[PDB]
Structure 1
Amino acid sequence: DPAGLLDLRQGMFAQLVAQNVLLIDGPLSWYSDPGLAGVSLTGGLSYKEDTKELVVAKAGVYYVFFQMELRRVVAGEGSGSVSLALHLMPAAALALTVDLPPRNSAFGFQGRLLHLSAGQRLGVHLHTEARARHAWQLTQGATVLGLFRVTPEIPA
């Protein structure tokens, strides 16, 4: 199973940083950075090993957010939009679109409450087009997926 495991108790928080910098269509690759607050990814992944798939171990409602920072690396060029979408695997649960000015930075954040069943597999896909992809990149280390568990277990 290539996925990392997120096992959160109520009131506990985890965040994942995207390895990607190029705006390439498809699943982002995530890792846990122990220098950041929160619980680490589990299920057999090594220290800072990145994965495109995540499994949420506990059923619950989670506040889930995306943050994305972009920057224009090719002077005088690029425009369009860049989107992220969280997909339940195997419509988007949570989506974030950020517009790029033809300022040389762009930023977006979006979160929401999501119900996630035990064992729920998750992926995040990025989409943009050629004009943006050829001139802009993700700022390194600033694309983050956050999860906060709101709800409890059933009493023993």
Structure 2
Amino acid sequence: MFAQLVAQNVLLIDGPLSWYSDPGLAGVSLTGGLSYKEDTKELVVAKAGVYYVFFQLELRRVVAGEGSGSVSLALHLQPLRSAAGAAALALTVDLPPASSEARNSAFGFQGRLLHLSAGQRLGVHLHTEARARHAWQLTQGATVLGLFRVTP
């Protein structure tokens, strides 16, 4: 009972990430009672329990000598168990400012245990503090949401 999706998105655009769900694709894997709703952009968990949920976010500078700021993932649970606006899992990655030394990429990983309800719909939202957001893109095949069950 585990899943791993690969974000389709490449441009840094505020709003929810779309995901590759077909397990014939490299990196992607769905099993058990886990499923992706293409319309709502949500992973749907059938069997309840506690899961180790993790997401990964790699970014690449695509316009040499330009682009700075920050990019953020946020995992939101629908329906809202909290019923406030609080993210279940959250990550922020600094985009370094194009120095002579120059680092042209940026990683970020987080994971933790989440008690998930039956029929819980997990979705991920991208937000970005743009100072030339066009100069950076999501590294393709690298932005990943994954989980696996710990409770039997």
**TM-score band (shorter)?**
0.7 to 0.9
**Is the alpha carbon distance of 1:38 and 1:150 closer, same or farther for their aligned partners in structure 2, counting shifts above 3 Å?**
farther
Q: TM-score, normalised by structure 1?
A: 0.79
Q: Residues 62 and 48 (structure 1 numbering): CA distance in 2 closer, same or farther, change over 3 Å?
A: closer
Q: Give identity over the alignment, percent.
A: 99
Deviation at 1:52, TM superposition (A): 1.1
Contact 1:19 1:50 in 2 (8 A): no
Deviation at 1:130, TM superposition (A): 2.6
Tell me by how many angstroms 1:85 deviates: 0.3
Deviations along 1:11-62, one digit per CA (max 9) or x if unpaired, are: x321000000001111100123535788844899999978611211111100
Unaligned runs of 5+ in 2: 80-85, 98-102
CA distance in 1, matches of 2:52, 2:65: 38
The 8 Å contact of residues 31 and 51 in structure 1, kept in 2 or not, is answered as no
TM-score of the superposed pair, with normalisation by structure 2? 0.81
Structure 1 stretches of 5 or more lacking a match?
1-11, 152-156
Matched, 1:117 2:106: no
Q: Give aligned pairs, total.
A: 140
Report what 2:149 is aligned to: 149
Q: Do the aligned partners of 2:34 and 2:46 also contact (CA within 8 Å) in 1? A: no
Change (3 A) 1:41 1:49: farther
The 1:22/1:16 distance shift into structure 2, 3 A limit, reads same
* CA-to-aligned-CA distance 1:67-123 (integer Å, 9 cap, x gap): 011000011111111000000114100001101100001101000100000001111
